[PDB]
C-alpha cells in the first residue's frame, strides 16, 4: 500500500522547530 | 458495435461512405498504403441492435499510399459489376482520378509535377456537372495544398481543363456546395474561409480566428481543421478548429452581422467535424489520439454526448447515409457502430 503525497511533507533539508 | 478487420499489412489513412451517389451508398472505400479497398454494408437479421453488418467486397491495388478519398456521383452497379469513379491523393504528390470496373483499374488520370501542386496536397473533392441537355458534360475535382494554391481540374467532353488560383495560405480543405455545383468552399490554414463560383472576384470570405468567443481563450495556435457545408441545399457552413472550437453560419433573408452560433468541442479535432447527413444541427468530432468521439448539437441539445470511446487511436471516420450508423477506420480496422437514438 503506497500513497504519494507531494503536497504536505517535512523539509528534509531544514532543521526542526 | 461490430468490428471488421482490414488485411494484416494494410495501414488505413482515410475512410469515406459513398453518400454522394444513391446507387452506391453501401460502398465503403479505405485508402491505404497499397490502394483502395471496397466493402458493402448490408442489413442482416442480426439482432436489431446493430442491424447492419459489413461485407468486404474487394481490394483495388494501386501500389502506393492513399491519403484522401472521394466517390463521385458517376458510381453505378450492374449484374455482377461495379462501375466506380474515385478521386484521391498519392505519395508522389499527384492528384488522381481512377475509374474502375470492380478491382481492375480500367482507366486512370494523373495531375502532378509542376502542372500539379508544388507542395503537399491537403484535401480533395469531386462533383459531376451536367449540361442543359443532361448528358455527362464535366466531372469536376477541386483540391487544396501547401503551395498556397487551389486547383480546379475539369474533365470535359473535349478533354481536360486545368486552372490554378492563388491562396493567402495553405489550403486545408475543400468541398463543393450541395444542390449547387456552381459554388464551393475552400479552407485556408490561417482561418480564412472562401466561397467561390468557379463558373465565373470570388464571392465571399469569412474567418473564424477573430470570432473566438474568448470566454475561454481558444489559445495562441487555433489552426482551422475543417469547413463543411450542411443541409441538402447547402443551406449552411460549419467550421471547426484544431482546438475544438466550432462555428455555424446559415445562408438563406434579412441582413447579417455575425456568425449565427458558436461553441467548443470537449477535445481537439485533428481530423475536423463530420456533419450529420440528415440532422444539420449535429456533427461528430474525434479525439483521434485517445480514440474518443464526441457528438455535438449546434443548438445545445447535446450536453456533451460521447457515444464512442475506443481504447485505441482513430484514423478516420464517417457517417453512413442512414444517419444512425458510423463507420470508423482505426489503425488496423474498421468498425460499424449503431447509435440507437438516431434510428
Amino acid at each position: 500500500k503506497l500513497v504519494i503525497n507531494k503536497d504536505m511533507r517535512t523539509d528534509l533539508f531544514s532543521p526542526p522547530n | 458495435s461490430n468490428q471488421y478487420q482490414l488485411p494484416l499489412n494494410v495501414r488505413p489513412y482515410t475512410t469515406t461512405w459513398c453518400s454522394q451517389s444513391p446507387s452506391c451508398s453501401n460502398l465503403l472505400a479505405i485508402g491505404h498504403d497499397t490502394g483502395i479497398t471496397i466493402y458493402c454494408a448490408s442489413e442482416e437479421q442480426t439482432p436489431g441492435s446493430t442491424g447492419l453488418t459489413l461485407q468486404e467486397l474487394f481490394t483495388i491495388q494501386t501500389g502506393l499510399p492513399t491519403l484522401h478519398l472521394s466517390f463521385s456521383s458517376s458510381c453505378s452497379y450492374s449484374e455482377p459489376v461495379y462501375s466506380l469513379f474515385l478521386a484521391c491523393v498519392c505519395q508522389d504528390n499527384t492528384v488522381r482520378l481512377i475509374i474502375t470496373k470492380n478491382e481492375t483499374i480500367i482507366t486512370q488520370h494523373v495531375l502532378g509535377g509542376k502542372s500539379g501542386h508544388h507542395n503537399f496536397v491537403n484535401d480533395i473533392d469531386i462533383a459531376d456537372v451536367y449540361s442543359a441537355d443532361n448528358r455527362l458534360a464535366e466531372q469536376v475535382i477541386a483540391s487544396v495544398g501547401d503551395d498556397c494554391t487551389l486547383i480546379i481540374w475539369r474533365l470535359t467532353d473535349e478533354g481536360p481543363i486545368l486552372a490554378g488560383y492563388p491562396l493567402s495560405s495553405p489550403g486545408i480543405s475543400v468541398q463543393f456546395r450541395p444542390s449547387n455545383p456552381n459554388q464551393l468552399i475552400v479552407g485556408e490554414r490561417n482561418g480564412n474561409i472562401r466561397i467561390f463560383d468557379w463558373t465565373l472576384p470570388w464571392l465571399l470570405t469569412l474567418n473564424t480566428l477573430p470570432l473566438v468567443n474568448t470566454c475561454h481563450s481558444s489559445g495562441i495556435a487555433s489552426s482551422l481543421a475543417n469547413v463543411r457545408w450542411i443541409g441538402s441545399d447547402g443551406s449552411g457552413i460549419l467550421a471547426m478548429c484544431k482546438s475544438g472550437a466550432w462555428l455555424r453560419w446559415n445562408l438563406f433573408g434579412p441582413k447579417n452581422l455575425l456568425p449565427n452560433v458558436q461553441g467548443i468541442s470537449l477535445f481537439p479535432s485533428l481530423l475536423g467535424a463530420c456533419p450529420h447527413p440528415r440532422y444539420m444541427d449535429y456533427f461528430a468530432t474525434a479525439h483521434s489520439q485517445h480514440g474518443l468521439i464526441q457528438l455535438i448539437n449546434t443548438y445545445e441539445k447535446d450536453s456533451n454526448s460521447i457515444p464512442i470511446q475506443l481504447g485505441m487511436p482513430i484514423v478516420d471516420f464517417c457517417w453512413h447515409q442512414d444517419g444512425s450508423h458510423l463507420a470508423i477506420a482505426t489503425e488496423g480496422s474498421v468498425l460499424l457502430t449503431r447509435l440507437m437514438g438516431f434510428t
Partner: protein, 306 residues
C-alpha cells in the same frame, strides 16, 4: 502448507521493506549534503519499527533523490504507474551521468596539476559505464520480472541517452552497448528485435533522419545474437522466428539505401560514412540470408546430422 506459506510470505515482504529502509538510513546518514541536525532526526524515525512504503518514498527516498531506491519501492509496492516509473528512470540516468562527468573532471585536474575543490577526495568509468552499472544493480535486485523493467519503454530511453550524450564511438565505446547490456541481463532476443522494430517504424526523436543508421546497427546486432542462440539451441537438443524478422531486415536495407543517398547530396559535401554504410548493408544481407534459411526449413532440421 497454507499456514506455512502465508507466514513465509508475510516475512518475505516485511524483509524486503526492511532492507529498503536500512539502505535508506545508511545512505542518508553518510550523505555529505545532509545537515547533521536532520540526520539525528532521520536516525530516530528509521532505526526502529518498519515503516510503510509510502512514508519511505515520500518522506525520505523522494526528498533525497535516491531514485534507485524509489524504483525498488515501486517494485515492492506492485506500483502500477508506467509514467512515474519512466520519470524515475530518466532522473536516475541523468543523475548518474552528471555524477560520472564530475568524477572524470576531477581526475583530469589531477593529471594536469590543478587543485580540486576543498574537501574532494581525488580513471573513473565513462558515464555510460556507471549508468549501466546502476541498471544492473537494480535488475539483479528486482529480477527483471518487475514492472520497473518495461523493455518497450526502458530500452528506447537508454538508447536515447546514448545518442543525445555521445556515448558512442567518439569516446571509444561500443556503439551497441545498450543492446549488449539488456541481452546479458537476460531480455529474450525476440522481445529486443520487437522493440527495435517499433523504434524504427515510428521515427521518434532522436531516432530520426540519418541517426536511424544506428538503429539499424542495433537491429543487426540483436538479430545476429538471436541467430546464434537458435543455432546453439539446435545443437543443444541434438545431444519464435517468423517471416516478420525477414521483412524487418528488408526494410532495414531500404533505410540504409535511403540514408546513404541523402548522405551523398548533403550541403557542404558528401557524407564520410559511405563505406561504413556499405559494410552494414553486407551484414544485414548476411543476416537476412541466415534468417531466410532458418525460416525456410533449416530450423526444423537443426537436430539432424549434416
Amino acid at each position: 502448507r497454507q499456514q506455512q506459506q502465508q507466514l513465509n510470505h508475510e516475512a518475505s515482504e516485511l524483509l524486503e521493506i526492511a532492507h529498503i529502509q536500512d539502505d535508506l538510513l545508511e545512505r542518508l546518514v553518510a550523505d555529505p549534503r545532509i545537515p547533521e541536525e536532520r540526520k539525528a532526526e532521520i536516525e530516530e524515525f528509521l532505526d526502529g519499527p518498519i515503516r510503510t512504503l509510502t512514508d519511505l518514498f515520500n518522506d525520505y527516498a523522494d526528498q533525497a533523490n535516491y531514485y534507485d531506491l524509489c524504483l525498488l519501492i515501486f517494485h515492492a509496492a506492485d506500483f502500477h504507474n508506467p509514467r512515474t516509473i519512466m520519470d524515475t528512470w530518466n532522473n536516475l540516468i541523468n543523475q548518474s551521468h552528471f555524477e560520472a562527468e564530475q568524477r572524470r573532471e576531477y581526475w583530469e585536474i589531477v593529471q594536469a596539476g590543478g587543485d580540486l575543490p576543498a574537501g574532494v577526495i581525488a580513471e573513473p568509468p565513462l558515464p555510460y559505464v556507471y549508468v549501466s552499472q546502476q541498471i544492473q544493480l537494480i535488475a539483479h535486485r528486482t529480477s527483471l520480472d518487475s514492472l520497473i523493467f518495461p523493455v518497450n519503454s526502458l530500452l528506447p530511453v537508454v538508447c536515447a541517452y546514448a545518442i543525445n550524450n555521445g556515448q558512442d564511438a567518439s569516446i571509444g565505446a561500443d556503439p551497441c552497448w545498450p543492446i549488449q547490456l539488456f541481452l546479458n541481463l537476460g531480455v529474450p532476443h525476440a522481445l529486443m528485435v520487437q522493440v527495435l522494430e517499433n523504434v524504427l517504424d515510428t521515427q521518434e526523436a532522436p531516432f530520426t533522419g540519418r541517426r536511424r543508421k544506428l538503429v539499424v546497427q542495433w537491429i543487426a546486432m540483436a538479430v545476429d545474437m538471436w541467430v546464434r542462440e537458435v543455432e546453439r539451441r539446435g545443437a543443444m537438443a541434438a545431444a519464435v522466428m517468423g517471416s516478420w524478422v525477414s521483412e524487418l531486415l528488408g526494410r532495414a536495407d531500404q533505410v540504409l539505401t535511403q540514408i546513404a543517398g541523402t548522405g551523398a547530396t548533403l550541403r557542404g559535401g558528401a557524407a564520410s560514412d559511405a563505406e561504413e554504410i556499405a559494410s552494414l548493408r553486407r551484414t544485414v544481407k548476411g543476416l537476412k540470408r541466415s534468417v531466410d534459411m532458418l525460416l525456410g526449413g533449416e530450423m526444423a532440421r537443426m537436430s539432424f546430422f549434416r
